[PDB]
Write a protein that binds this DNA or RNA. Sequence first.
DNA 1: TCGGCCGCCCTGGAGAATCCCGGTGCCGAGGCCGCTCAATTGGTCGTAGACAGCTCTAGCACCGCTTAAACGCACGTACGCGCTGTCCCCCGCGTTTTAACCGCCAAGGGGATTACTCCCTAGTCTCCAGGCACGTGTCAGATATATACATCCTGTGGCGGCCGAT
DNA 2: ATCGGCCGCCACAGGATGTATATATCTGACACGTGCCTGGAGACTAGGGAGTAATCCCCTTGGCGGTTAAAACGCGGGGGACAGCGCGTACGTGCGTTTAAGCGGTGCTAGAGCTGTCTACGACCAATTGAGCGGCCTCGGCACCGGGATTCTCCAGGGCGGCCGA
Lengths: 83, 81, 53, 55, 98, 99
Amino acid sequence: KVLRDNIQGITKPAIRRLARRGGVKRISGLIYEETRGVLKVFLENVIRDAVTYTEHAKRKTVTAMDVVYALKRQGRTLYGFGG
Amino acid sequence: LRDNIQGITKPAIRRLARRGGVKRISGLIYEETRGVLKVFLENVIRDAVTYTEHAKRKTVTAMDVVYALKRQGRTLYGFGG
Amino acid sequence: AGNAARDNKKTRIIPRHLQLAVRNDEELNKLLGRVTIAQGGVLPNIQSVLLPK
Amino acid sequence: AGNAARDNKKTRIIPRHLQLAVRNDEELNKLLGRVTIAQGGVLPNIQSVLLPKKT
Amino acid sequence: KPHRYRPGTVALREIRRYQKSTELLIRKLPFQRLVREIAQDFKTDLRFQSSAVMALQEASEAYLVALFEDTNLCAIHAKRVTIMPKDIQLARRIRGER
Amino acid sequence: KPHRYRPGTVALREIRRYQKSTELLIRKLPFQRLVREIAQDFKTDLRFQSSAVMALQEASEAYLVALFEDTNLCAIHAKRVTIMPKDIQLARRIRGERA
DNA sequence: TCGGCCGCCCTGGAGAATCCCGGTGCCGAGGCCGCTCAATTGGTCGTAGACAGCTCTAGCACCGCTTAAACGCACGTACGCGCTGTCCCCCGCGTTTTAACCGCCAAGGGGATTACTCCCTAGTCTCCAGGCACGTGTCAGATATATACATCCTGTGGCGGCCGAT
DNA sequence: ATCGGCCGCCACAGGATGTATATATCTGACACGTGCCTGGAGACTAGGGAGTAATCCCCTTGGCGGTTAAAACGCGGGGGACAGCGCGTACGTGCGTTTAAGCGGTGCTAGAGCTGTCTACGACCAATTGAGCGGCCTCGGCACCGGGATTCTCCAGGGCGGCCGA
Ligand SMILES: [Cl-]
């Protein structure tokens, strides 16, 4: 089945929790759609690079090492899963 | 040997801001901009002089400043490379 | 990180303690500014204008 | 860059023409966003709110 | 009528509560579905380790929390306490990802 | 009888004139003196190639022009057309350079 | 009933700036030539990786409870936003200073290059012991339940300003 | 006329709530022992990358004459920054509703992952030679001074209500 409309799975309270961790007091209504857009474009870039690393590794399962290498390549080094 | 940061003149910061597209410049801009420029030059010249130290030389080549700016993620074209 | 574990009254260093150990130091923050530590979150930082008068 | 030289009515590519060639293209801007080209300046970009209300 | 707080007090209470906590705020399974949905447009029948999706979630939440930190600084800078897509776009523009 | 323009028109005229030009806006010799002054606090008796100081000036002016671009975006965002050190600090903070 | 000043709309003409167009010089890019050293070809081994097969890990799939949390609706009030008044600070511009630029020359610090030595590491071989997978204990801490202490929204008492009333 | 009601504002505190802190349970994840084997270490040799001296000339710095574009300073104003205030709207809080996330189970199998074979693909070595780089030159594309068209800027005036106020 072709997965669709999963960007709505990033719910409004989850975006509010993320805002609270960032220190945001008050949140307007268009924040949620804008944030789903920005997170979508971020995951587009990161999953694109991780899929590329999978492609060259002659595999079909995206490992955690692939996502670590991808995030590290984009200047956002993730600790906890190797590197 | 202390007014060299004042050599970055108020017309020169104004010309830079005009190239950046700034229409109006408050008076408290200029000292702040001298400060920020001085901090940037501190980081760059620190790295370039480190590279000169490693080459056991007494002069700072343009390749050293290119390597420094490249290390700091601001790649500069037109000076070797 | 052992210091931040002591402050949290704990004898086992968790990710949060590494997070606090790096981000509360200035030069370790300069070293790891573009580095995400998992299961760490951020510092408990609240801006002054958001607090009620 | 030859295109921007043609637009500037010149037959010699200068740094400014490389600057315009990279920064007016989107994907070359994505490639060289963190890259300074010397003797190039910036794009002629003026924001809309800074213009006088010529209405 | 029962007790009811001011907005600022529960808002600041949640700001304190979630800056102390470390757990993942986005739920695991809809984020996993989003990751599979985005991946689908690159290769059909892709598989994912659990730690890979956990790594994606850790980095995505950390990225969005740094984004809301810069967005809150944009809001505060504009003499406001309300974040706006103006503020998100300003943040991403100054960071260089536009 | 003496002609005088409005502020916005000469301001925008200079914005256009310097966004068209490519020459270095900081003068060569005071920038060189600033570079030697900053270098002095790292090693005594340092020498510099001319192209090294030119490279420093190209990168420094490009950095400050991108900084004033972001500063102008901060000003415009705050319903102003006048840049402030608030705007510079916001720009450097979002860029991650506050250290 | 009156015309004296006062902001609005339009339009016109000075007026500085800029675009366009030639005219002349100038100096760096295009092109030609030596040469020299690395690109190419032929040939030889050595081993990194392509490929087949086996395995066994965990990744996907499904289902059943289980409450955790998302969704929706009313509501109220606090901040976003528009308007306006002030004022002060920056911008254009004239005048004066000033040091940046050019350019010209001089002395020497050291960048780079070559020669020669020299000693530090690459690589083999052999030995051996510290690091890792696996197994087993054991206690650090997450949480349920218990008081129970700050804390904050609000209920309300009190002091003062003031505002109208008899 | 002064005095109580009422609002503004301050503030003092029952009361509900969230949360900092006290014990009990149980875990399962961290710490530690054991086998062992493969990577760390010791020894030896070759050689080639690296250390060091001398040379020389590149080019880096220091110094002076003028001049002039540029920087510094003052000044008048005007327009944008900043504060204040009112409208409203739209976001947060609370409660009920309900959607589905999470956990716990098992079954299956695609595929990660490790092992053996060999072969074909690349490193290593010498000859050679022609493509690529130092040097030179000349010349035309670019830089630049001057003039006219033009092109936007801006303020002055003419008409125009219009607004009263003296
Ligand atoms: Cl300020």
